[PDB]
């Protein structure tokens, strides 16, 4: 560890450039996994609608889908509102 | 041809249904020929290396013979399998469309005239 820490500082002396970029790429590639928000990003990305939410024929016994757009039934993105 | 047959799983050397056929007999004359092929490769090998052809490296010859016999065996199973497969759907096909293979009306030679040609 002493020589490795010496080598890393050895790098920083004779060159400050590629060590900084190697650091930048190193973090930018690892934090994606260690993230509490990347799940929100895909949830946000899918939340935005580009197409009409095609209605389905009501044959009865539809538990969760609403009948009115203001009905409480259905998915709510309130988690985005406080976000 | 039978590429595209119904149920042919790709890149399957020996399909599971091929096991329903009689496996090749242990000393199959076809199988032992590949043993001959393996033996020659060992004999030829020492010739290029400038070694005693008949006596150098029995370990080298043993690997050559064993590999040829083994690789032959599975190749011999697929050998009869495809021929069995080729004959199988052939036999069923003649039954599904009887119109094109009609009953050959057998007639003895007492009816048919064969024109005789002198040989002088």
């Amino acid at each position: 560890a002493g020589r490795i820490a010496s080598f890393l500082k050895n790098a920083w002396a004779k060159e400050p450039v590629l060590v900084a970029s190697f650091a930048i790429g190193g973090l930018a590639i690892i934090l994606p996994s260690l993230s509490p928000y990347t799940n929100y990003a895909i949830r946000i990305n899918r939340a935005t609608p580009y197409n009409y939410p095609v209605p389905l024929r009501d044959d009865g016994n539809m538990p969760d889908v609403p009948s009115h757009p203001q009905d409480p039934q259905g998915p709510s993105l309130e988690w985005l509102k406080n976000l | 041809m039978m590429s595209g047959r119904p149920g042919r799983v790709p890149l399957q050397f020996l399909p599971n249904e091929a096991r329903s056929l009689p496996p090749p007999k242990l000393t199959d004359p076809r199988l032992v020929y590949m043993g001959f092929l393996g033996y020659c490769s060992g004999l030829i090998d020492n010739a290029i290396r400038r070694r005693p052809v008949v006596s150098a490296g029995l370990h080298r010859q043993l690997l050559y013979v064993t590999s040829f016999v083994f690789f032959g065996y599975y190749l011999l199973k697929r050998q009869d399998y495809m021929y069995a497969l080729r004959d199988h759907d052939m036999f069923a096909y003649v039954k599904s469309h009887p119109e094109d293979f009609p009953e050959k009306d057998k007639k003895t030679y007492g009816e048919i005239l064969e024109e005789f040609h002198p040989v002088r």
Binding site: A47, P49, Y52, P53, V54, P55, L56, R57, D58, M62, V65, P66, S67, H68, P69, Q70, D71, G74, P75, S76, L77, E78, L80, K81 | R5, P6, G7, E17, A18, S20, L21, P22, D28, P29, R30, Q79, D80, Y81, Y83, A84, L85, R86, D87, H88, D89, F91, A92, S96
Partner: protein
């Protein structure tokens, strides 16, 4: 290949809305949350029938139902509505973030005179169980019959009769 029979010019005279985009988009959410009954089954007709010609009866109703919503505002806080939609157009994107104060004025008026609440975020973007009377088409694409697939291969495998049968080779 046949006849391309299509509806005459008789049924294509609906009381077309004479408004512009800004006034259409100024209400939008309230119109969507108060005229969903003729919107949903008409759009469902558009998808299920897969043909514009068969949904003419629902096509006129949505336009007609728009008028009842629109003239309802005229008997009510239409003056705040005019100030709103005359401020939206000025923006080139027709964006609501620059007209929040008039957004309130339209909302506070419509809240008590009529009661149309502001649709919360994501409420419009929701699949709905629209009730309908028409039966589903038996083949929306008018697909013809289907070719009969070739008979299935079956039967237990049998050893190849007389072996390879290729020239003189046996076994």
């Amino acid at each position: 290949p046949g006849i391309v029979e299509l509806p005459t010019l008789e049924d294509l005279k609906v009381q077309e809305v004479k408004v512009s985009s800004s006034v259409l988009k100024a209400a939008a959410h309230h119109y969507g949350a108060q005229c969903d009954k003729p919107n949903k089954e008409f759009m469902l007709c558009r998808w299920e029938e897969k043909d514009p010609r068969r949904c003419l009866e629902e096509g006129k109703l949505v336009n007609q139902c728009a008028l009842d919503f629109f003239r309802q505002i005229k008997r009510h806080c239409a003056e705040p509505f005019t100030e709103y939609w005359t401020c939206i157009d000025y923006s080139g994107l027709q964006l609501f973030r620059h007209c929040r104060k008039q957004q309130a004025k339209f909302d506070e008026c419509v809240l008590d005179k009529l009661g149309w609440v502001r649709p919360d975020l994501g409420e419009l973007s929701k699949v709905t169980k629209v009730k309908t009377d028409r039966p589903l088409p038996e083949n929306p694409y008018h697909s013809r019959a289907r070719p009969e697939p070739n008979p299935e291969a079956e039967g237990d495998l049998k050893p190849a009769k007389h072996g390879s049968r290729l020239f003189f080779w046996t076994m």
